[PDB]
Design a binder for this molecule. Structure first.
Ligand SMILES: [Zn+2]
Lengths: 91, 176, 1116, 37, 77, 194
C-alpha cells in the first residue's frame, strides 16, 4: 500500500481481469438450486459454490485441491474465490 | 404471440423456468383464478389437484416453483435504516468459537495420539486421515508400513481399544 | 347516574354540551363507506332533523360512477345497480386466532343489456372479500389489529399566492388550480409585466393564445378586459390571431415533432380537462371553488368550465390591480385577496372511509380497463357478467392497501389511551401528500385556526414534529372532509343554550368569545369587558354585547391525551407536549388504581375505548366468574361476555381484565362490567400514585434520576406482566420434511426433561436462556465427516447421523413461565401456507418488577431512570413514620418551567387526607360549598378539569383545613411542606420539605429490552462486517464521529483494531479469537474486506484501480 | 433522442404507407421473384 | 489496585512525551506477555517481569510498573 | 478553450489512450458480492445488479441474433440503442429520464449508486463500521464510584469478556476443557461470575 493508481480501464485490461466469458442470463436451475453453466453464478468462471466441491459430482474432497476437472471445468478451491473472481461480457 | 410468449417464458423470471413448467404454472394459475370466480372462495388443494388432473404433490411443487425473488435493496420498514440486505446472516462465515474449538480438538487429539506408541499412533492416524484429508483403508496402510492387511487391521483394533480406555477419554469426551 | 365512580369535582363552570363519542371519527366514516343500516339511519335522522348529510353511500357511489361499458359500437352495457353484504363467516376472536382478515362477502347485481340482442340478463357477481372494521375501529388483518389513521391534505380548488421578487423589486402574484385527480394548471400574472399560463409547466406561453384557442373571440375579450391595461398590453403584444392559429400553435408547443391537427388538438384539450374522468374534481373541490370564485350555484358535480377559467383570470387580475372588492363573475360582490395554504379551511382529513373508497376506486378502474379489453377481444352471445369481470384488481388493491401502506399503521395497545390517541391522529405524511422531505417551517408551525380542530400541545417530538397531530376533543368532521367545532349561540348579550358547528372558514366571519369568560347570575355577561378573538387570530377585546359565538367548554383546544393532565395551565407548552407523548407509553400493571387527582374526563376516555367490556342490556347478573360473566335482561335474552385473560397485545403486554360487578346488582345500558388493562372501575389508570418528597438525596437522583423505595419492589406496586410469543414451523425442504420430535440429535438427556410427547414444552414450566421450547430436527444433509470427527466417532462408537438439530431455543437473556402453546397441523383440517407442515407458537410470560435502570415518568413530562432502590428504612420518613415512596430532584422543576407538578403533589396530599369545610365564611370556602366539594372523606379521588382547575387559594385554604390524620395534628404545614426525618442519619432535616401524592407511570422503555452485548456473533454477507440489531446479536456501530474523536486523541492503534480486528476482516477475527483463548499476543492486522469490496466495485466501473508499491508492484 | 425511448421508437416508425390488398400481393410477388433470382 | 494506581506524571517526565510512552509501554507489555506464554521453549532473548508479579495479572500493569520504577530503558533505532 | 486545453492536455500527458471512453467489454461483479442467497420458506433474495446484468446480457444476445441474420437497419439500430440504455442503467440507473424501475415500486440499484450517498460504501461501510466486542444499555447515576470507574451489569460484562473468561476458567481448572468452559459460561454458574 503505497499508491492507489486509478485510470481508464481499456478493453484489453478488462479481458485480462476476466477468468472467462458470460454468454447466458441463466442464474440457477429452478429444481436443483445450483448455478447453471456459463451464465451468471457459473462456477467454471467465478468459482465453486462449496469448498473444493466441483459441479459434476467428480473430484469432491479437500485433498486433491488445485486441479481442474475435465467434466464441468470447475477449479476446486475455497469458495472464497467467488468473492474475488470476476467475469466479463462481450458486446 | 408465439415469439412474445416464448421469450416472456424464457427471460421474464429471475430463476429461469423451463417452458413446459411455464405453461403448467400459468395453466394452474388461470384455472385457479377461474374457480375462485365461480366458487367465490379459495379452492382446496384436492379440488385443484383433480381440476389439473395431476396429483396434489405436483400442485404443491408447481405452486412453490412459481414464485419471484424479493429484492435485498428495499426499504426495511423504517425511514432509512439500511435495507433488507443488511438484516439476514450468512452461513459461510466461520464462527470463531467453532474454529478455535476445532483447533483445540486437533491439538488435544494429536497429543493423545502422541501418548500412544509411535507405530500405533501412526496407523490410527492413517486409518482416519489426521495427516491428510483422505483416510487410508487397512490394506491401504499396509504398503508404506509393510504390514499385512490383517496385521494392520489387528493393530488398528488394538489402537481403538487402547484409546477407548478411560485414561485417554476424559479429555476427548467433552469435545464430542 | 351510576355511570362512573364518584369523583369530587373542582370545576367552576357548568358544561352544556357533553363530549361526543370519542371514536366517532373512525366508526362513522366506515359506517358511511359501507352504507350499511347505520349510515342510512343517521342520514334519515339528519334529514328529518333538517341537518345536511350525504344521502348517497360510499360503495354504491363509486359503483354508480362507473357508467356501463360501451364498446366502439356502443351496443352493450353493464349495470352495477345494487350492492349487498352477507354476514362474515369467521368470528372476530376466530379471525384473530387463526390469522384471517376479518372480512365479509360483497355481492352486486350486474345487468347485461345489448341493443343488438334487445335482451336483459341479470346475474349476481361477487367482487371478493372486503376487510371489515370491528365496532372498536380496528381492522383485524392477518391476526394483527391495524388502524387506518386520517390524512391531512390540501383540498382541491383554486389557490392564489402573493410573493415578492428581489430582482423585480415588485410583487408577483400566482394562481394554481389543484385538481382532485387530474393534471394541474397554473396562472402567473405579471411575471415580467405580462400574465401567462402553465399547462403542467410544459413550456412558456401567454394567456391570449389560450383564450383565442377557445371559442371566445378577441372583440369580446377586450370588451370584458378593456378596463385593465396589463391585459390589453398582453393582447396587443400577441401577434397571433384566430382560433385555429392559436390552437395549432399551442398544440405544436405541447406536442412538438408532428404537424398540427385541428381535431386532434381539440380532442386533446377536451381530454385533459373537460373530460369528466381525467379531471374528476371532488365534490369538496366544486363546493369550495363556487364559494371562492363567488359563482352562484354552478354545476353541483363536474369539471371546470371555460367560464370558471375566465372567472379565475378576472379574479387574478383584480387581485393584482390592488382592488380589494369586485363584482364576482356571474355572482355577487366578493373580496379579492390572497389565500394562505396553511389555513385549516384549506386542509382536509381523508378519513378511513375515503381512503378505502379511493383504493376500491383504483381497483375498479383496473377492472374497467380489463373488461374493456375483454370486450374488444370477445364474441357476442358468449358474454356474461359472471365471466367477463375479473375480480383480481379490487382484491389485490384492497389487500395491498391494508398491508404495505403508511396510513394502515400497526395498532399500539400499550394502554387504552394509546389506543384512542392512535385512532384520532391525523398523519400529514402519506401518499399524494406532504412527505417528510417536503416538510417546511410553515406546515409544522401552529396556526390560529387550530383551535378546537387539532391539538397544538401533543405531537411526536421526532423529526416529524407537528406534521402528526391529534384531533381536538370536540372535533367533528364536515362531510366534505373539513373539521367542525361546536360553539354556543349568543344574542343581545345573552349566551343561549343552542349549539352550532363551525368549520375553519365560517369561524372567520363571526367574532368568537372565550369560554373562560365569566357570566352573571342571569344568563347575561357579568362584565362588559370580555376577551374575544376574531379574524386572523387576533385577540383584541370587545366590551359589551357584540359577540355571537363562544366556546362551549374550555377544553375544546386540547386532545384527550393532553386533556388528561391535571393542572395543565401551569405547565410550559414543551413539558405538556412531552407529558402527552409519554402518557401514551405507560404499561398496565398487576393492579391498577385510578388517579387520586386527575382530570374529570378519564372516565370517558376509558369507557369509549374498546378495551373495557360494557353491557348491551339492562338486566341482572346471574353468574360472575373470572373467565366469563353472564347477564339476563328482563326481556329474557341471556348474554355471556368472555373476558380475555393474559392474551398478548401488540406490545407484548398483558390485557388481563378484572370484574367489578357483584352477583345480584342491577345493571344499566352502557354500564361497565369488567375493567381493561390500565383501568379501574371504568376509570383510566395508567400507573400508581406514590408519596413523593422533593429533595436531593446523596446524588443518587442527580440529573433527574429517581429514587424509590424497595416498598414498590416488595408490594408489587409497580410490576407489569410481559408475554412474548415466538414460533417455529415444520417446513419441507428438498431433502425431506422437518419433524417436531422429542428425539433431537446430539443432545444430552436432561435438556429434554420438561418436553411433551411430540416435542413441545409443557405448560407452566419455567424456562431460561438456552432452554428447548420445541424440538425440531433437519431432515438430512450431505455430511462429509472430517478426519478428526471420524476418529472421534470411531473412538466413542457414536454414529453422527444425517439428521441435524435445528430446534427452537429461547433467545439469549430471557426468563419466563410458559402459559400456552398452540399447534397447527397441515394434515389436520386447519389450513397453513404452502410447505409448512406444522406450526407451533409458545407464550412465555414473566412478571417484570420495577428495577434499577427502568424508565419512570410522571404526567408533566418529568421522566427519569431508576438509579437506586433503597430499603424502606433509608427513606426519609414523615412525622408519623410513613416513608416517602419516591424522591425527585427539585432542580428539575424551575428550569423545566412545569410548576404544575408541585401543584399536583400538594393537591394529591389534600385528596389523600380528607377535609371538612362548613360555615367558614371564607371566599374559597364559599366557592367550595357552592361547588359541592366541601365535605370530603379521606381517600376519595378529586377532579380538576384541564383549564378550570383548583385555584391556588383553594389549595392553601384546604391545607389550613386538612383532616387530622392522627392524634389531632396535621403533618403538613400551611406552606405545604413537612418535617422529614432522615432515615439513614436519623436527625430531622434542617428545614421542612415539600411532600404529597404524585401520579407516576411505568414507561415501556424498560432496561431488560434495551440491554445487549456481543462477544462475537452473526456476520453480514455482502460485506463481512457484523450485522445490526438486538435480535441478531448485533455489534454497536462505530460511526464516523467516533473515529474522528479517536483520531483527535491521537490513538491510532485502537482505531486499527476497531476497524480491522474487531470487524471487516475474516482472516483476523478467527486469529484474534484463537490468540485470546490460547493467551498468545494479538496478531498483526491484515487488510479489511470492505476495501476489497470497494476495489472490486470500482474495477467493475472500468476504472483499473490498481494497488502499487514504490518499488514496482506491491505485496498484499 | 429523448426520455422514455418507446416514444422515440414510435416516432421512428413515423409515417409509412399502409398496404392494401393488391399492394401487398404485388410486393409478395416481387419477393418471390427476388427469391428465385 | 487500579487503572490510575501508577500516576501518569512520572511516566511522562520519564519518556518526555505521551504517545511515545504509550507505544513503549505497549512494546514492553507485548514482550512480557510473550514470555508468559512461552510454555517451555525458553528462548534466551525473552525476559520476564523485572518487578514482582501477582499470581494473575495483566501484562500492561507490569510494563507500566517497570516504567515507573525506571529500571527499563528505550532507544530509538 | 481553457477547459478544452485542460482535458486534452490531461489526456496527452497520461499514457492511456482516449478510447477508454467507449468500452468494448463490460466487467461483471463477482457473484458473491451480488448474492442470490437462499431464503427459508422457498423464497429468494436477489440484488438488483442481477436484474441489470440479466438485462444487458439479454439485449446483447438479441443483438447478436439480429446481426446473424440479414435484418433491417431500423431494428438493428433500435437494438443497439436498447443495449446502450441497458449498459447506462447498469452503471448509472436514473441519470437519463426515468430510471429502470424494475418491479415498479422503487428504482433499481446500480453500480454507481452503491458507491454514492449516505448509504453508499464510502461513508457507511469504510469510515463507520460495526464492531464486535461491544454492548449498549441505559445509564444510571452512580455517585459512590471514583472518577475512573464505570459499572457494567453482570450479563453485559460476562458477554463482552467471553474469550477472557474462558481462558481464565480453563487455567484455574474450574472447567475441564475449552468447550466445557463455553458450556459453563453459557450456563452462568457462580464460579463464572467469580
Ligand atoms: Zn466436475
Amino acid at each position: 500500500f503505497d499508491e492507489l493508481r486509478i485510470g481508464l480501464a481499456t478493453a484489453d485490461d478488462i479481458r485480462q481481469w476476466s477468468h472467462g466469458e458470460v454468454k447466458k442470463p441463466e442464474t440457477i436451475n429452478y429444481r436443483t438450486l445450483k448455478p447453471e453453466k456459463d451464465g451468471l453464478f457459473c462456477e467454471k468462471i467465478f468459482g465453486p459454490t462449496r469448498d473444493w466441491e466441483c459441479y459434476c459430482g467428480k473430484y469432491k474432497r479437500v485433498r486433491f485441491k488445485g486441479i481442474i476437472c475435465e467434466r464441468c471445468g470447475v477449479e476446486v478451491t475455497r469458495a472464497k474465490v467467488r468473492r474475488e473472481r470476476m467475469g466479463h461480457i462481450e458486446l | 404471440r408465439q415469439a412474445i410468449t416464448r421469450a416472456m417464458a424464457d427471460q421474464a423470471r429471475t430463476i429461469r423456468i423451463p417452458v413446459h413448467m411455464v405453461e403448467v404454472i400459468n395453466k394452474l394459475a388461470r384455472v385457479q383464478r377461474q374457480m375462485l370466480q365461480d366458487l367465490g372462495r379459495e379452492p382446496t388443494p384436492e379440488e385443484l389437484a383433480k381440476e389439473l388432473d395431476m396429483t396434489p404433490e405436483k400442485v404443491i411443487e408447481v405452486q412453490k416453483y412459481g414464485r419471484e425473488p424479493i429484492s435485498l435493496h428495499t426499504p426495511l420498514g423504517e425511514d432509512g435504516d439500511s435495507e433488507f440486505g443488511d438484516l439476514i446472516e450468512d452461513s459461510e462465515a466461520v464462527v470463531p468459537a467453532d474454529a478455535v474449538s476445532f483447533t483445540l480438538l486437533q491439538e488435544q487429539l494429536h497429543s493423545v495420539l502422541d501418548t500412544l506408541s509411535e507405530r500405533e499412533a501412526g496407523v490410527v492416524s492413517m486409518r482416519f486421515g489426521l495427516t491428510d484429508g483422505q483416510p487410508k483403508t487397512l490394506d491401504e496402510i499396509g504398503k508404506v508400513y509393510g504390514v499385512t492387511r490383517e496385521r494392520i487391521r489387528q493393530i488398528e483394533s488394538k489402537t481403538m481399544s487402547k484409546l477407548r480406555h478411560p485414561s485417554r477419554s476424559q479429555v476427548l469426551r467433552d469435545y464430542l | 347516574a351510576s355511570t362512573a365512580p364518584l369523583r369530587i369535582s373542582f370545576a367552576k363552570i357548568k358544561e352544556p354540551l357533553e363530549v361526543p363519542n370519542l371514536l366517532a371519527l373512525q366508526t362513522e366514516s366506515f359506517d358511511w363507506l359501507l352504507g350499511n343500516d347505520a349510515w342510512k339511519a343517521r342520514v334519515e335522522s339528519a334529514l328529518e332533523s333538517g341537518q345536511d348529510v350525504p344521502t348517497k353511500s360510499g360503495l354504491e357511489e363509486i359503483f354508480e360512477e362507473i357508467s356501463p361499458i360501451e364498446d366502439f359500437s356502443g351496443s352493450m352495457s353493464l349495470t352495477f345497480r345494487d350492492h349487498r353484504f352477507e354476514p362474515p363467516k369467521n368470528s372476530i376472536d376466530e379471525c384473530k386466532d387463526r390469522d384471517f382478515t376479518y372480512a365479509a362477502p360483497l355481492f352486486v347485481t350486474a345487468e347485461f343489456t345489448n341493443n343488438e340482442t334487445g335482451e336483459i340478463k341479470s346475474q349476481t357477481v361477487f367482487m371478493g372479500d372486503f376487510p371489515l372494521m370491528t365496532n372498536k375501529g380496528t381492522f383485524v388483518i392477518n391476526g394483527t389489529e391495524r388502524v387506518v389513521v386520517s390524512q391531512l391534505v390540501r383540498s382541491p380548488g383554486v389557490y392564489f399566492d402573493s410573493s415578492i421578487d428581489k430582482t423585480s423589486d415588485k410583487d408577483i402574484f400566482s394562481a394554481k388550480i389543484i385538481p382532485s385527480r387530474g393534471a394541474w394548471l397554473e396562472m402567473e400574472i405579471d411575471k415580467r409585466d405580462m400574465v401567462g399560463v402553465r399547462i403542467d409547466r410544459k413550456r412558456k406561453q401567454s394567456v391570449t393564445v389560450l383564450l383565442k384557442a377557445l371559442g371566445w373571440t378577441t372583440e369580446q375579450i377586450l370588451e370584458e378586459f378593456g378596463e385593465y391595461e396589463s391585459m390589453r398590453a398582453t393582447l396587443e403584444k400577441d401577434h397571433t390571431q384566430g382560433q385555429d392559429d392559436a390552437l395549432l400553435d399551442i398544440y405544436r408547443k405541447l406536442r412538438p415533432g408532428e404537424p398540427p391537427t385541428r381535431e386532434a388538438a381539440q380532442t386533446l384539450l377536451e381530454n385533459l380537462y373537460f373530460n369528466p374522468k381525467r379531471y374528476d374534481l371532488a365534490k369538496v373541490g366544486r363546493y369550495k371553488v363556487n364559494k371562492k370564485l363567488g359563482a352562484d350555484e354552478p354545476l353541483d358535480a363536474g369539471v371546470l368550465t371555460t367560464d370558471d377559467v375566465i372567472a379565475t383570470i378576472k379574479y387574478l387580475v383584480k387581485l393584482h390591480a390592488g382592488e380589494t372588492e369586485t363584482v364576482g363573475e356571474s355572482g355577487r360582490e366578493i373580496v379579492v385577496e390572497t389565500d394562505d395554504i396553511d389555513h385549516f379551511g384549506n386542509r382536509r382529513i381523508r378519513n378511513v372511509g375515503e381512503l378505502i373508497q379511493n383504493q376500491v376506486r383504483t381497483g375498479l378502474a383496473r377492472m374497467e380497463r380489463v373488461v374493456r379489453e375483454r370486450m374488444t377481444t370477445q364474441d357476442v352471445e358468449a358474454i356474461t357478467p359472471q365471466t367477463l369481470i375479473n375480480i383480481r384488481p379490487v382484491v389485490a388493491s384492497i389487500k395491498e392497501f391494508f398491508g404495505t401502506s403508511q396510513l394502515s399503521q400497526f395498532m399500539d395497545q400499550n394502554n387504552p389511551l394509546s389506543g384512542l390517541t392512535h385512532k384520532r391522529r391525523l398523519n400529514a405524511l402519506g401518499p399524494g401528500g406532504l412527505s417528510r422531505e417536503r416538510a417546511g417551517f410553515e406546515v409544522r408551525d401552529v396556526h390560529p385556526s387550530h383551535y378546537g380542530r387539532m391539538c397544538p400541545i401533543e405531537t411526536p417530538e421526532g423529526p416529524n414534529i407537528g406534521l402528526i397531530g391529534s384531533l381536538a376533543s370536540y372535533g367533528r368532521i364536515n362531510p366534505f372532509g373539513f373539521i367542525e367545532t361546536p360553539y354556543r349561540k349568543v344574542v343581545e348579550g345573552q349566551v343561549t343554550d343552542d349549539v352550532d358547528y363551525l368549520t375553519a372558514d365560517e369561524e372567520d366571519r363571526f367574532v368568537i368569545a372565550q369560554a373562560n369568560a365569566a357570566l352573571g347570575d342571569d344568563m347575561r355577561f357579568a362584565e362588559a369587558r370580555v376577551l374575544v378573538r376574531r379574524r386572523g387570530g387576533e385577540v383584541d377585546y370587545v366590551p359589551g354585547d357584540d359577540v355571537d359565538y363562544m366556546d362551549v367548554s374550555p377544553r375544546q383546544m386540547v386532545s384527550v391525551a393532553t386533556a388528561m393532565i391535571p393542572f395543565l395551565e401551569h405547565d410550559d407548552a414543551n413539558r405538556a407536549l412531552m407529558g402527552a407523548n409519554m402518557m401514551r407509553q405507560a404499561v398496565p400493571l398487576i393492579k391498577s388504581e385510578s388517579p387520586l387527582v386527575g382530570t374529570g374526563m378519564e372516565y370517558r376516555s376509558a369507557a369509549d375505548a374498546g378495551d373495557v367490556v360494557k353491557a348491551e342490556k339492562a338486566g341482572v347478573v346471574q353468574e360472575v366468574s373470572a373467565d366469563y360473566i353472564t347477564t339476563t335482561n328482563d326481556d329474557g335474552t341471556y348474554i355471556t361476555y368472555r373476558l380475555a385473560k393474559f392474551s398478548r397485545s401488540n406490545q407484548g403486554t398483558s390485557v388481563n381484565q378484572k370484574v367489578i360487578v357483584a352477583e345480584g346488582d342491577r345493571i344499566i345500558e352502557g354500564q361497565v362490567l369488567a375493567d381493561g388493562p390500565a383501568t379501574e372501575n371504568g376509570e383510566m389508570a395508567l400507573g400508581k400514585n406514590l408519596l413523593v418528597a422533593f429533595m436531593p438525596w446523596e446524588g443518587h437522583n442527580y440529573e433527574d434520576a429517581i429514587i424509590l423505595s424497595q416498598r414498590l419492589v416488595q408490594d408489587d406496586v409497580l410490576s407489569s406482566i410481559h408475554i412474548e410469543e415466538h414460533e417455529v414451523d415444520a417446513r419441507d425442504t428438498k431433502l425431506g420434511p422437518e419433524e417436531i420430535t422429542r428425539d433431537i440429535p446430539n443432545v444430552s438427556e436432561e435438556v429434554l426433561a420438561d418436553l411433551d410427547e411430540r416435542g413441545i414444552i409443557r405448560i407452566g414450566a419455567e424456562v431460561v436462556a438456552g432452554d428447548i421450547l420445541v424440538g425440531k430436527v433437519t431432515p438430512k444433509g450431505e455430511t462429509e465427516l472430517t478426519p478428526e470427527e471420524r476418529l472421534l466417532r470411531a473412538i466413542f462408537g457414536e454414529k453422527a447421523r444425517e439428521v441435524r438439530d435445528t430446534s427452537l431455543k429461547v433467545p439469549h437473556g430471557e426468563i419466563g413461565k410458559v402459559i400456552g402453546v398452540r399447534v397447527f397441523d397441515r394434515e389436520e383440517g386447519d389450513e397453513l401456507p404452502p410447505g409448512v407442515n406444522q406450526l407451533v407458537r409458545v407464550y412465555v410470560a414473566q412478571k417484570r418488577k420495577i428495577t434499577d435502570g427502568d424508565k419512570l415518568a410522571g404526567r408533566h413530562g418529568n421522566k427519569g431512570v431508576i438509579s437506586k432502590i433503597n430499603p424502606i428504612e433509608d427513606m426519609p420518613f414523615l412525622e408519623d413514620g410513613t416513608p416517602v415512596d419516591i424522591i425527585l430532584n427539585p432542580l428539575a422543576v424551575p428550569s423545566r418551567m412545569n410548576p404544575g407538578q408541585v401543584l399536583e403533589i400538594h393537591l394529591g396530599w389534600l385528596a389523600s387526607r380528607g377535609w371538612d369545610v362548613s360555615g367558614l365564611a371564607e371566599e374559597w370556602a364559599q366557592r367550595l360549598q357552592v361547588i359541592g366539594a366541601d365535605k370530603v372523606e379521606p381517600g376519595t379521588n378529586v377532579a380538576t378539569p384541564v383549564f378550570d382547575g383548583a385555584r391556588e387559594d383553594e389549595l392553601a385554604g384546604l391545607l389550613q383545613h386538612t383532616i387530622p390524620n392522627r392524634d389531632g395534628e396535621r403533618m403538613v404545614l400551611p406552606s405545604g411542606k413537612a418535617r422529614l426525618f432522615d432515615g439513614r442519619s436519623g436527625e430531622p432535616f434542617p428545614e421542612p420539605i415539600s411532600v404529597g401524592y404524585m401520579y407516576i407511570l411505568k414507561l415501556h422503555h424498560l432496561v431488560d429490552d434495551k440491554l445487549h452485548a456481543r462477544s462475537t456473533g452473526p456476520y453480514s454477507m455482502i460485506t463481512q462486517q457484523p450485522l445490526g440489531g438486538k435480535a441478531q446479536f448485533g455489534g454497536q456501530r462505530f460511526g464516523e464521529m467516533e473515529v474522528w474523536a479517536l483520531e483527535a486523541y491521537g490513538a491510532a492503534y485502537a482505531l486499527q483494531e476497531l476497524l480491522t480486528i474487531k470487524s471487516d476482516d475474516v482472516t483476523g477475527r478467527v486469529k484474534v479469537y484463537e490468540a485470546i483463548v490460547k493467551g498468545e499476543n494479538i496478531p498483526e492486522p491484515g487488510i479489511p474486506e470492505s476495501f476489497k469490496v470497494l476495489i472490486k466495485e470500482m474495477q467493475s466501473l472500468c476504472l483499473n484501480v490498481e494497488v502499487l508499491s514504490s518499488d514496482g508492484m506491491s505485496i498484499e | 433522442a429523448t426520455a422514455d425511448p418507446v416514444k422515440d421508437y414510435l416516432k421512428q416508425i413515423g409515417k409509412v404507407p399502409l398496404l392494401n390488398a393488391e399492394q401487398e400481393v404485388e410486393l409478395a410477388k416481387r419477393i418471390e421473384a427476388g427469391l428465385f433470382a | 489496585e487500579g487503572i490510575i494506581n501508577p500516576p501518569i506524571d512520572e511516566l511522562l517526565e520519564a519518556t518526555d512525551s505521551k504517545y511515545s510512552l504509550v507505544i513503549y509501554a505497549a512494546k514492553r507489555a507485548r514482550q512480557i506477555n510473550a514470555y508468559y506464554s512461552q510454555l517451555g521453549e525458553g528462548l534466551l532473548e525473552y525476559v520476564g517481569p523485572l518487578v514482582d508479579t501477582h499470581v494473575h495479572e495483566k501484562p500492561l500493569s507490569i510494563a507500566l510498573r517497570e516504567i515507573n520504577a525506571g529500571l527499563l530503558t528505550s532507544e530509538a533505532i | 478553450a481553457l477547459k478544452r486545453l485542460k482535458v486534452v492536455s490531461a489526456f496527452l500527458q497520461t499514457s492511456n489512450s482516449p478510447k477508454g471512453m467507449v468500452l468494448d467489454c463490460v466487467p461483471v461483479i463477482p457473484p458473491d458480492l451480488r448474492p442470490m442467497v437462499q431464503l427459508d420458506g422457498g423464497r429468494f433474495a436477489t440484488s438488483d445488479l442481477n436484474d441489470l446484468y440479466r438485462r444487458v446480457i439479454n439485449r446483447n444476445n438479441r443483438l447478436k441474433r439480429l446481426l446473424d441474420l440479414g435484418a433491417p437497419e431500423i431494428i438493428v439500430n433500435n437494438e443497439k440503442r436498447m443495449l446502450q440504455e441497458a449498459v447506462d442503467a447498469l452503471f448509472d440507473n436514473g441519470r437519463r429520464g426515468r430510471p429502470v424501475t424494475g418491479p415498479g415500486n422503487r428504482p433499481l440499484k446500480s453500480l454507481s449508486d452503491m458507491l454514492k450517498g449516505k448509504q453508499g460504501r464510502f461513508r457507511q461501510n469504510l469510515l463507520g463500521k460495526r464492531v464486535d466486542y461491544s454492548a449498549r444499555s441505559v445509564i444510571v447515576v452512580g455517585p459512590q464510584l471514583k472518577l475512573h470507574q464505570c459499572g457494567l451489569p453482570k450479563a453485559m460484562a460476562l458477554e463482552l469478556f467471553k474469550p477472557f473468561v474462558m481462558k481464565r476458567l480453563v487455567d484455574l481448572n474450574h472447567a475441564q476443557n475449552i468447550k466445557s468452559a463455553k458450556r459453563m459460561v453459557e450456563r452462568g454458574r457462580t464460579v463464572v461470575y467469580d
